[PDB]
């Protein structure tokens, strides 16, 4: 129930993303597994976002940064302006055609480990802007870990996607050292939130009438 | 610079430091997500559902008004008919990776079947799983509009509702009747 | 022939009536019972325009453009206040008994009655009483029948009898209980009965073959073919 | 007589002056619903007409807009000169409080107009945009290159034959060769701009400020030529935030374009919604009642306070103090609580409709409005006394990137900058829309110098006046309908739709095919949160817009940027960027 990705920019592959993904089993060792759990906990409980913004979704993201929401409680407030110091790219805005090379460059300039959260309908699929100058989804050329529907998603939805990213990180397998062991990245094939919440979503019967407040 | 300007600036820095200290002695304004639930207004435009009539049947008549009123084009459906003659959606899919949660489909629904519920936690790992189907949209209740049924107004005969049994409808008078 | 529509001079054919002459020029007059192939009968009373005999005339007279010839020297007004109120009133009278059926109607989005209700600008209902209802007949595998949506414009019977030569469709009934169909249930055995779904301005006669797998007109991808 | 009537505008003295100057057979006058005299003039006399308007006793000193229009598909052109393309120039005289719109007709093969940059220096970006999107060449233009599209783009996107959707073209395939080609295209070439990349003593430093910069308020880049820390010249490179919203206006119905109007200036919301729905109501002939006007004024002033709070907090953050942004966004959350209660959404409400609003006010909105009006002024006074009266902030702000009224007028600067130059020109008072005459509020003006500090303090005073407007409208809200009784009110009221067949028919044909607005031209100019926002809508008589032209102030401000910061340091540029109140959806549209 895992997927393995190995990347190779210099290999024979012209289209982005320059990676290969297969479906494998969990490789996980009486102490290596515990140390992998400890580093996964340390990575998931300390995620530093990239100060990269495209459009209105970034405004709601920095609304989440402020005091009335306090995403700092999750340890995700540091907001580095450099790609090298950042661990998470939140594509929060429209993936414009003129900025897709810029987004690809900034994704290349981040360092391992890296995670991608697409925020909003523009970043997910292009959204309302099925237009000549908009890339229909940032996942056309970068691998996206978490998707957030919304236009804009409210800040608590951004923290919900951050918690989903933390749950994804906390059970993935990565190379502990770059000199010993396999260098491929193992990510879990988790159950989707739609089928998980279908039990509690279908059973909804009555809501408050729109004339109230 | 002038000495008075320097003194005024020193007092200004001291005053700013004092006010941020009194901010430290103030009350916290954070809403503690996710430990306390987020208050959402009753007409908040979040996750889209398909609702039912008070009789318990699905309120959608597959009239395709929401799909064409959608400025994004992220609603797809097909009309099917039961044996009695009532219309229903054979399928109903919404691409939530593409939807902008604008509420034009709810505004354009003439049966109040499609509604935007106060729900925002729809984060997903794969955007193929963001294509919600009819089994993920149809809920077991009326939603925000509790006592509206479109078929009580329609003049089309279905099960449990013969001709003339709708609201503001007279009984069908046959042309073979003896009355002038 | 030369006519004057709203003070504008137009050159029309004098052997045509005012409705087809004005519709040829691009002037929008509401109409139900007139068809280019069937002729003019003056039934629906929807095509009313105010006619003047002189260039200096204030009162005028509300006439039917489908029944009035486009002779030389006629001064008609389409968007006069009296004519617009009368056309809105005709739409309102047709709307008194019409069922609340547009979402569950195969003619929705392709409806002449919808277009003419919108064109006259009638969107407020002051009628508060009951609406008459009708039973439906089985017309065979091709044509679905829904008699409540009828506006009694007589296009179906005129086409089916005076044009197609059919013998099993007719008008029955009375004052406001007019029925349009067959004397019993059965298949319409005319070989041209399928044109009723386009002749009828309402959703009375509908394509049952299309009603099995129904989509609206805007959802259809069309092509010109043979 | 209603204000949406088609006025020929032959009573304007500017028309009489043009007749007495150029003769009675030199131009045509078009009768529109713009409220502005539309003069079709010949291409040969365009510069003479512009010079005559610039040399008037109360002259037209501002070029409000300059853009093209494809008239090849326009069926209803009665009373208009024959044209395959056209170029319109919208000009404002503040002294007369009047506008004029000059239109030049062009054939398909002879697509060249004389440049307007010598008369008005802000015409440069407008002419580059018209060349980029319509292919119209401007003779005598200094550097006519693409401004919205990358340099390796084939075709002009706003032409009628160009496909609007991305699904028409192949899906975006990013390969190594395409990445290299677009990176070479995006690389700044100083020899093209005449930057002269060197001196005998030392070498100039070419720095990309943006797209990925904390100081850049979006996806755009200023390329700085530097010596040490000083800025020699700037090339503000825009077009990175282009969503094709005007081509989208040609692609959506009149009702279904409202959410796209909401995202034009994403800190504006209902302020972005108002000019579009007002222009559509002018097209339809809808006069909204008093309650609709008061509700729309409520929501637009609430969003103006929201945008001003974000602007003030952003300016304080870029000056260096990182504390008040948290509290300002807490106040934004209070406003968002009220807006969520009313419209059902936070930041892009899309709540205005043609002829009214989407719903009535919910029961209990006045409680949240009273809560916000009690919460606000103490917080604002705290922000003032903590950061806006800081001598370090004053040193970073006062005297930085200063210009007078001449620079504000020649570059089309509107909003707080123009009033900070001492020119008292606000749309809510000069050309009152949406019943703003019923509200007692003041218009703050400056002393004649448009500093960073002056613009920020003017926006603080605008926030206080918006609080006054909110108090007045809370204390006096009418009890009437939230939608008009016009047949073209889209959509009709919901309960009548659910239980009447006429209303059901109107709703069915208005949400599916769209409302049919008759063929006319309409224009609405409003005071946005960042300046003056205008919608110019050409209807072909169909259910979709034939042309949707959106004029925004941030475009003019970013074009003004090199003329006001040249010779300064980069810190002055950072404060100038923080004190302009721009977003980049506003610029690129
Ligand atoms: C502990 C000792 C604290 C001494 C400073 C207290 C300052 C109190 C205060 O609120 O000062 C702010 C005020 C700002 O002045 P202004 O912006 O004109 O506002 C007028 C209304 N306050 O500031 C002023 O009006 C300035 C007057 C106070 C100047 C104090 C000078 C102390 C001696 C010099 C020390 C610094 C020397 C630097 C070299
Ligand atoms: C191995 C030790 C690692 C230490 C990592 C410390 C990270 C920085 C924490 C403090 C901090 C700084 C300096 C900082 O620069 C900053 O940005 C304004 C913060 O707020 C978001 C901070 O919280
Ligand atoms: C982390 C501590 C709180 C940060 C709050 C930031 C609020 C917004 C700052 C202004 C800004 C906006 C609006 C903005 O749109 C933008 O471009 C993407 C910026 O650069 C990153 C900005 O700095
Ligand atoms: S999804 Fe909506 S809010 Fe987010 S960037 Fe796109 S238009 Fe803006
Ligand atoms: S909320 Fe708007 S974008 Fe989403 S499905 Fe409904 S109409 Fe379409
Ligand atoms: S508008 Fe309502 S009734 Fe019509 S197809 Fe959509 S959900 Fe069904
Ligand atoms: S016939 Fe036309 S007006 Fe009547 S219910 Fe059908 S679509 Fe509506
Ligand atoms: S059934 Fe149709 S064609 Fe016949 S009279 Fe009625 S509305 Fe007219
Ligand atoms: S069209 Fe003339 S009365 Fe019917």
PDB file of N, CA and C in Angstrom, chain B residues 155 163-164 168-173, chain C residues 94 96-99 127 129-135 146-152 176-178 204:
ATOM      1  N   UNK B 155     -47.258  20.141 -12.344  1.00  0.00           N
ATOM      2  CA  UNK B 155     -48.496  19.618 -12.882  1.00  0.00           C
ATOM      3  C   UNK B 155     -48.333  18.265 -13.542  1.00  0.00           C
ATOM      4  N   UNK B 163     -53.452  13.801 -11.384  1.00  0.00           N
ATOM      5  CA  UNK B 163     -53.716  15.088 -12.013  1.00  0.00           C
ATOM      6  C   UNK B 163     -54.693  15.901 -11.173  1.00  0.00           C
ATOM      7  N   UNK B 164     -54.374  17.176 -10.972  1.00  0.00           N
ATOM      8  CA  UNK B 164     -55.191  18.052 -10.165  1.00  0.00           C
ATOM      9  C   UNK B 164     -54.913  18.003  -8.680  1.00  0.00           C
ATOM     10  N   UNK B 168     -52.870  24.701  -5.942  1.00  0.00           N
ATOM     11  CA  UNK B 168     -53.575  25.639  -6.824  1.00  0.00           C
ATOM     12  C   UNK B 168     -53.984  24.983  -8.141  1.00  0.00           C
ATOM     13  N   UNK B 169     -54.415  23.728  -8.069  1.00  0.00           N
ATOM     14  CA  UNK B 169     -54.830  22.974  -9.241  1.00  0.00           C
ATOM     15  C   UNK B 169     -56.256  22.477  -9.063  1.00  0.00           C
ATOM     16  N   UNK B 170     -57.061  22.636 -10.106  1.00  0.00           N
ATOM     17  CA  UNK B 170     -58.418  22.118 -10.118  1.00  0.00           C
ATOM     18  C   UNK B 170     -58.431  20.685 -10.640  1.00  0.00           C
ATOM     19  N   UNK B 171     -59.537  19.993 -10.380  1.00  0.00           N
ATOM     20  CA  UNK B 171     -59.703  18.637 -10.874  1.00  0.00           C
ATOM     21  C   UNK B 171     -59.828  18.637 -12.398  1.00  0.00           C
ATOM     22  N   UNK B 172     -59.292  17.615 -13.068  1.00  0.00           N
ATOM     23  CA  UNK B 172     -59.389  17.558 -14.535  1.00  0.00           C
ATOM     24  C   UNK B 172     -60.821  17.294 -14.976  1.00  0.00           C
ATOM     25  N   UNK B 173     -61.353  18.200 -15.787  1.00  0.00           N
ATOM     26  CA  UNK B 173     -62.708  18.077 -16.309  1.00  0.00           C
ATOM     27  C   UNK B 173     -62.630  17.435 -17.686  1.00  0.00           C
TER      28      UNK B 173
ATOM     29  N   UNK C  94     -52.313  33.272 -20.679  1.00  0.00           N
ATOM     30  CA  UNK C  94     -51.793  31.938 -20.957  1.00  0.00           C
ATOM     31  C   UNK C  94     -51.088  31.345 -19.744  1.00  0.00           C
ATOM     32  N   UNK C  96     -52.098  31.721 -16.591  1.00  0.00           N
ATOM     33  CA  UNK C  96     -53.000  31.492 -15.466  1.00  0.00           C
ATOM     34  C   UNK C  96     -53.198  30.007 -15.199  1.00  0.00           C
ATOM     35  N   UNK C  97     -53.257  29.193 -16.250  1.00  0.00           N
ATOM     36  CA  UNK C  97     -53.497  27.765 -16.106  1.00  0.00           C
ATOM     37  C   UNK C  97     -52.276  26.914 -16.417  1.00  0.00           C
ATOM     38  N   UNK C  98     -51.143  27.520 -16.715  1.00  0.00           N
ATOM     39  CA  UNK C  98     -49.982  26.744 -17.123  1.00  0.00           C
ATOM     40  C   UNK C  98     -49.327  26.097 -15.908  1.00  0.00           C
ATOM     41  N   UNK C  99     -48.975  24.815 -15.979  1.00  0.00           N
ATOM     42  CA  UNK C  99     -48.428  24.129 -14.807  1.00  0.00           C
ATOM     43  C   UNK C  99     -47.002  24.555 -14.501  1.00  0.00           C
ATOM     44  N   UNK C 127     -52.483  36.190 -10.511  1.00  0.00           N
ATOM     45  CA  UNK C 127     -53.539  35.190 -10.472  1.00  0.00           C
ATOM     46  C   UNK C 127     -53.329  34.280  -9.269  1.00  0.00           C
ATOM     47  N   UNK C 129     -55.921  31.919  -8.166  1.00  0.00           N
ATOM     48  CA  UNK C 129     -56.928  30.877  -8.146  1.00  0.00           C
ATOM     49  C   UNK C 129     -56.356  29.574  -8.698  1.00  0.00           C
ATOM     50  N   UNK C 130     -57.230  28.596  -8.912  1.00  0.00           N
ATOM     51  CA  UNK C 130     -56.802  27.273  -9.330  1.00  0.00           C
ATOM     52  C   UNK C 130     -56.468  27.248 -10.818  1.00  0.00           C
ATOM     53  N   UNK C 131     -55.712  26.228 -11.207  1.00  0.00           N
ATOM     54  CA  UNK C 131     -55.337  25.993 -12.591  1.00  0.00           C
ATOM     55  C   UNK C 131     -56.008  24.719 -13.083  1.00  0.00           C
ATOM     56  N   UNK C 132     -56.541  24.765 -14.300  1.00  0.00           N
ATOM     57  CA  UNK C 132     -57.196  23.595 -14.862  1.00  0.00           C
ATOM     58  C   UNK C 132     -56.170  22.527 -15.220  1.00  0.00           C
ATOM     59  N   UNK C 133     -56.591  21.271 -15.120  1.00  0.00           N
ATOM     60  CA  UNK C 133     -55.733  20.138 -15.420  1.00  0.00           C
ATOM     61  C   UNK C 133     -56.392  19.263 -16.475  1.00  0.00           C
ATOM     62  N   UNK C 134     -55.582  18.407 -17.089  1.00  0.00           N
ATOM     63  CA  UNK C 134     -56.046  17.516 -18.140  1.00  0.00           C
ATOM     64  C   UNK C 134     -55.380  16.159 -17.987  1.00  0.00           C
ATOM     65  N   UNK C 135     -56.112  15.115 -18.358  1.00  0.00           N
ATOM     66  CA  UNK C 135     -55.515  13.798 -18.479  1.00  0.00           C
ATOM     67  C   UNK C 135     -54.701  13.719 -19.767  1.00  0.00           C
ATOM     68  N   UNK C 146     -48.539  15.641 -23.029  1.00  0.00           N
ATOM     69  CA  UNK C 146     -48.700  16.304 -21.730  1.00  0.00           C
ATOM     70  C   UNK C 146     -49.627  17.499 -21.942  1.00  0.00           C
ATOM     71  N   UNK C 147     -50.920  17.277 -21.724  1.00  0.00           N
ATOM     72  CA  UNK C 147     -51.947  18.219 -22.148  1.00  0.00           C
ATOM     73  C   UNK C 147     -52.059  19.447 -21.247  1.00  0.00           C
ATOM     74  N   UNK C 148     -51.485  19.414 -20.041  1.00  0.00           N
ATOM     75  CA  UNK C 148     -51.603  20.556 -19.136  1.00  0.00           C
ATOM     76  C   UNK C 148     -50.864  21.783 -19.655  1.00  0.00           C
ATOM     77  N   UNK C 149     -49.811  21.586 -20.442  1.00  0.00           N
ATOM     78  CA  UNK C 149     -48.966  22.679 -20.902  1.00  0.00           C
ATOM     79  C   UNK C 149     -49.515  23.390 -22.129  1.00  0.00           C
ATOM     80  N   UNK C 150     -50.693  23.005 -22.608  1.00  0.00           N
ATOM     81  CA  UNK C 150     -51.233  23.576 -23.832  1.00  0.00           C
ATOM     82  C   UNK C 150     -51.730  24.997 -23.617  1.00  0.00           C
ATOM     83  N   UNK C 151     -51.561  25.826 -24.644  1.00  0.00           N
ATOM     84  CA  UNK C 151     -52.020  27.205 -24.634  1.00  0.00           C
ATOM     85  C   UNK C 151     -53.140  27.431 -25.638  1.00  0.00           C
ATOM     86  N   UNK C 152     -53.657  26.354 -26.242  1.00  0.00           N
ATOM     87  CA  UNK C 152     -54.766  26.387 -27.204  1.00  0.00           C
ATOM     88  C   UNK C 152     -54.466  27.311 -28.382  1.00  0.00           C
ATOM     89  N   UNK C 176     -63.011  26.718 -22.143  1.00  0.00           N
ATOM     90  CA  UNK C 176     -61.613  26.712 -21.737  1.00  0.00           C
ATOM     91  C   UNK C 176     -61.135  25.299 -21.449  1.00  0.00           C
ATOM     92  N   UNK C 177     -61.935  24.294 -21.798  1.00  0.00           N
ATOM     93  CA  UNK C 177     -61.580  22.892 -21.648  1.00  0.00           C
ATOM     94  C   UNK C 177     -61.209  22.258 -22.982  1.00  0.00           C
ATOM     95  N   UNK C 178     -60.546  23.016 -23.857  1.00  0.00           N
ATOM     96  CA  UNK C 178     -60.147  22.498 -25.159  1.00  0.00           C
ATOM     97  C   UNK C 178     -59.094  21.414 -24.984  1.00  0.00           C
ATOM     98  N   UNK C 204     -46.384  19.985 -24.959  1.00  0.00           N
ATOM     99  CA  UNK C 204     -47.465  19.007 -25.034  1.00  0.00           C
ATOM    100  C   UNK C 204     -47.011  17.781 -25.810  1.00  0.00           C
TER     101      UNK C 204
END
